[PDB]
Amino acid sequence: PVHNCDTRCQTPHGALNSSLPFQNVHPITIGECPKYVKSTKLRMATGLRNVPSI
Amino acid sequence: GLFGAIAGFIEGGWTGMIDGWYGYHHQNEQGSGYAADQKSTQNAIDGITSKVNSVIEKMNTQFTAVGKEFNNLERRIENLNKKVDDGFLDVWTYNAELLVLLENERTLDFHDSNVRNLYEKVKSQLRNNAKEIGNGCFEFYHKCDDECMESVKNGTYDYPKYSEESKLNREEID
Amino acid sequence: GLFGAIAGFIEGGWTGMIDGWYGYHHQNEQGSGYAADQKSTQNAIDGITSKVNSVIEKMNTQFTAVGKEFNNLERRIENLNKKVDDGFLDVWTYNAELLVLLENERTLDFHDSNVRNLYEKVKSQLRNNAKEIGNGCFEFYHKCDDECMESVKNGTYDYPKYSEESKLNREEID
Amino acid sequence: GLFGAIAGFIEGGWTGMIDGWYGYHHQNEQGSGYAADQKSTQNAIDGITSKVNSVIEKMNTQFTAVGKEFNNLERRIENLNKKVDDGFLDVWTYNAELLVLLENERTLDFHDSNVRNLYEKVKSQLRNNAKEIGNGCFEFYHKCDDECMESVKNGTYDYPKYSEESKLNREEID
Ligand SMILES: *[C@@H]1O[C@H](CO)[C@@H](O[C@@H]2O[C@H](CO)[C@@H](O[C@@H]3O[C@H](CO)[C@@H](O)[C@H](O)[C@@H]3O)[C@H](O)[C@H]2NC(C)=O)[C@H](O)[C@H]1NC(C)=O
Ligand SMILES: *[C@@H]1O[C@H](CO)[C@@H](O[C@@H]2O[C@H](CO)[C@@H](O[C@@H]3O[C@H](CO)[C@@H](O)[C@H](O)[C@@H]3O)[C@H](O)[C@H]2NC(C)=O)[C@H](O)[C@H]1NC(C)=O
Ligand SMILES: *[C@@H]1O[C@H](CO)[C@@H](O[C@@H]2O[C@H](CO)[C@@H](O[C@@H]3O[C@H](CO)[C@@H](O)[C@H](O)[C@@H]3O)[C@H](O)[C@H]2NC(C)=O)[C@H](O)[C@H]1NC(C)=O
Ligand SMILES: *[C@@H]1O[C@H](CO)[C@@H](O[C@@H]2O[C@H](CO)[C@@H](O)[C@H](O)[C@H]2NC(C)=O)[C@H](O)[C@H]1NC(C)=O
Structure with missing residues (x-):
């Protein structure tokens, strides 16, 4: 359906409001959108191995 | 490689x-x-x-990318278009996954290196009066209070202030 | 980088x-x-x-990829097709060779790190009674049999069992 | 990771x-x-x-790459051509920048590893008669001239030539 918010990226499944570099929704975009890839998880570590004490 | 500190000679x-x-x-x-x-x-x-x-x-970021249309006598160009889109998609998904996988070992080894260097510094500024005992602990033959604790922390230990007195206690235990 | 063990302080x-x-x-x-x-x-x-x-x-894996055909008035599209195929081939051959070249230094440094850590562990659980002599060998001031050999191997050495007796022999050599 | 020598325990x-x-x-x-x-x-x-x-x-290296021409009823193919050129250009500029950024940490850590190993070698062939004092310096309880300097440099030190005499001086300072 059509509503009247305001975005900067649009796909046929809906709109997107993010600043992450990758994207997973749909490959047909209008506006300025993050890049479509064919993956499911791109978590990136900034920290230590969580080794609890015994 | 693994520098040996995190889950190494130091425990959890x-x-x-x-x-x-x-x-x-x-x-x-x-x-x-x-x-x-x-x-x-x-x-x-x-x-x-x-x-x-x-x-x-x-x-x-990518800009607008909208599909195209072809009739029944332009099958050849349509297959070429599909080939271009699938090729570029495979290249970018490969680059993304491979970049994350290598970056993760890089960052974990970075933390491991930091812990090892932070241990070596404390060992180096407590040359004689320490008697290290295991999993990164030291034990001060002389007597220490809060001021020499901060003196160790900052990196200003002035070893020759204590060097004689420690020596006495060391020869007591030997 | 090179951790210093393989073809380093340890010989062949x-x-x-x-x-x-x-x-x-x-x-x-x-x-x-x-x-x-x-x-x-x-x-x-x-x-x-x-x-x-x-x-x-x-x-x-790739699926079926069969060449196409063009007459003498579609030279332009034919050159475009050839450009697409050669471009993707160059990209994949670059990725393959570069991935193997970086992965090889990663794995050799991994083995080097393992040897260095395996040396540091044995040194750390033989603090006083060893007298290391060169290229990763130790020499037991006290007397050892098969049981203390396995005791070193597993990682259960119980140093205070021998700590006095070794001391005697050390003061014999000094 | 950082091996700890350059701008580490050794100063500038x-x-x-x-x-x-x-x-x-x-x-x-x-x-x-x-x-x-x-x-x-x-x-x-x-x-x-x-x-x-x-x-x-x-x-x-790349060979000849010259632009093409299209009339006003071949807009579709023209957009496809532009898409191919821009895609390959983005892929190559990504590969170039990323390769240089990773190669730089690799080479700086390589130099750092070399300095650390060059320090460990000199420490290992001066086991007892040195008394290291800080930021990678040693101090020879015995007496040294140019010949034992070169003897250290090459990697041929023959420690048991001096091992007794040093011992005397060590017991003088203790
Ligand atoms: C690192 O730690 C040292 C401690 O070894 C710090 O220097 C210390 O600065 C404190 C400031 O609270 C001094 O404590 C007080 O100083 C005042 C002024 O003289 C005095 O009236 C107090 O009775 C008390 O002594 C402390 O004495 C001084 N260090 C010494 C020589 O004991 C230092 O600022 C910390 N930071 C760095 C980077 O050094
Ligand atoms: C690591 O090495 C230790 C050795 O320090 C192993 O513990 C040892 O288990 C063996 C089993 O053959 C013991 O030998 C025999 O035990 C039986 C049962 O008491 C006894 O009847 C035999 O005469 C002989 O002693 C051995 O004594 C025991 N360690 C001690 C205290 O000497 C251990 O299982 C190995 N594995 C690990 C992970 O520790
Ligand atoms: C590494 O350094 C050693 C020094 O420990 C070098 O061996 C030395 O070779 C020099 C050559 O100038 C010897 O000096 C002279 O030898 C001649 C010939 O015997 C003699 O007539 C001179 O009076 C003077 O002694 C030096 O004596 C010798 N080393 C010893 C035992 O002192 C070695 O060549 C250098 N290179 C390597 C890889 O070892
Ligand atoms: C997109 O999401 C972001 C983050 O949720 C929104 O930015 C903030 O949203 C909160 C909650 O509405 C506001 O209190 C902040 O004032 C917003 N910050 C900014 C950027 O001014 C952003 O408004 C969302 N955009 C839309 C159109 O939904």
Whole structure:
């Protein structure tokens, strides 16, 4: 359906409001959108191995 | 490679330490410890922040990409178009996954290196009067209070202040 | 970088050792050695196996790719088709060669790190009674048999059992 | 990761040293120092030269690439052509920048590893008669001249020549 918010990226499944570099929704975009890839998880570590004490 | 500190000669982490990544644990005459080391952890935060921002800013955003249309006598061009789209998609998904997988070993080894260097510094400025005992602990033949604790922490220990007195106690135990 | 063990402070390898990658060589009262260290080599095998399987499963197989045909008034599209095929081929051959070249330094440094850590562990659980002599050998001031050999191997040495007796012999040599 | 030598436990570099990358600084009975270590620096030069030549020879040169022309009823093919050119350009610029950024940490850690190993070698062949004092300096309980300086440099020290005499002086200071 059509509503009247305001975005900067649009796909046929809906709109997107993010600043992450990758994207997973749909490959047909209008506006300025993050890049479509064919993956499911791109978590990136900034920290230590969580080794609890015994 | 693995530098040998995290889950190595040092055992598991400290839950009770909050305000940093690398710190100390001291037991002088009037208290217990858990103070962080604000010098090295700031360098770690700077490095990791620059790394994440670099990885973000190498990837350009894409502009409008809308499908095209072909009739029944342009099958050849249509297959060419589909080939181009699938090729570029495979290349970018490969680059993304491979970049994340290599960056993760890089960052874990970075933390491991920081812990090892923070141990070597403390060992190097306590040359004779320490008697290290295991999993990164030392034990002060002489007597220490809060001031020599901070003196160790900052990196200003002035060993020749204590060098004689420690010696006495060492020869007591030997 | 190079951790300094393989072709470093330790000389060349052992041909006589068979059942592993990292091991020991002992000379107590009744034998010679060459026993492997099954704990660390298993971690190395697990890491390398996961690495090779990851590199295999990142590369997708290709399906049917058959050439196309053009007459003499479609030269323009034909050149475009050839450009697409050659471009993608160059990209994939670059990715393959570069991935193998970086992965090789990664794996050699991984083995080097394992040897250095396996040396540091043995040094750390023989603090006073060893007298290291060169290229990763130790020499037991006290007297050792097969049981203390296995006691070193597993990682359960219980130093205070021998700590006095060694001391005597040390003061004999000094 | 960071091996801990350059801007680590060793302070800043030496401007006065010219003919190499890694060297010594000696103060025996009749001079000061600044002599380079021609063995290790040659291995560093070989490694870096091979690295740069490999990075050059992985990148193929391009041949003639001239733009094409289309009339007003071939807009569809023209957009496809522009898409192909921009896609390949983005892929190659990504590969170039990312390759340089990773190669730079690799080479800086390589130099850091070389300095640490060159320190560990000198420490290992001066086991008892040295008394290291800080930021990578040693101090010879016995007496040394130019011949034992070169004897340290080459890697042929023959410790048991001096082992008794040093011992005397050590017991003088203790
Ligand atoms: C690192 O730790 C040293 C401690 O070894 C710090 O220097 C110390 O600064 C404190 C400031 O509280 C001094 O404590 C007080 O100084 C005042 C002024 O003289 C005095 O009236 C108080 O009775 C008390 O002594 C402390 O004495 C001084 N260090 C010494 C020589 O004990 C240092 O500021 C810390 N930071 C760095 C980077 O060094
Ligand atoms: C690592 O090595 C230690 C050796 O320090 C192993 O513990 C040892 O288990 C063996 C089993 O053969 C013991 O030998 C025999 O035990 C039986 C039962 O008491 C006894 O009847 C035999 O005469 C002989 O002593 C051995 O004594 C025991 N360690 C001690 C205290 O000597 C251990 O199982 C190995 N594995 C690990 C992970 O510790
Ligand atoms: C590494 O350094 C050693 C020094 O420990 C070098 O061996 C030395 O070679 C020099 C050559 O000038 C010897 O000096 C002279 O030898 C001649 C011939 O015997 C003699 O007539 C002179 O009076 C003077 O002694 C030096 O004596 C010798 N080393 C010893 C035992 O002192 C070695 O060549 C250098 N290179 C390597 C890789 O070892
Ligand atoms: C997209 O999401 C972001 C983050 O949720 C929105 O930015 C902030 O949203 C919160 C909650 O509405 C506001 O209180 C802040 O004032 C917003 N910050 C900014 C950027 O001014 C952003 O408004 C969302 N955009 C749309 C159109 O939904």
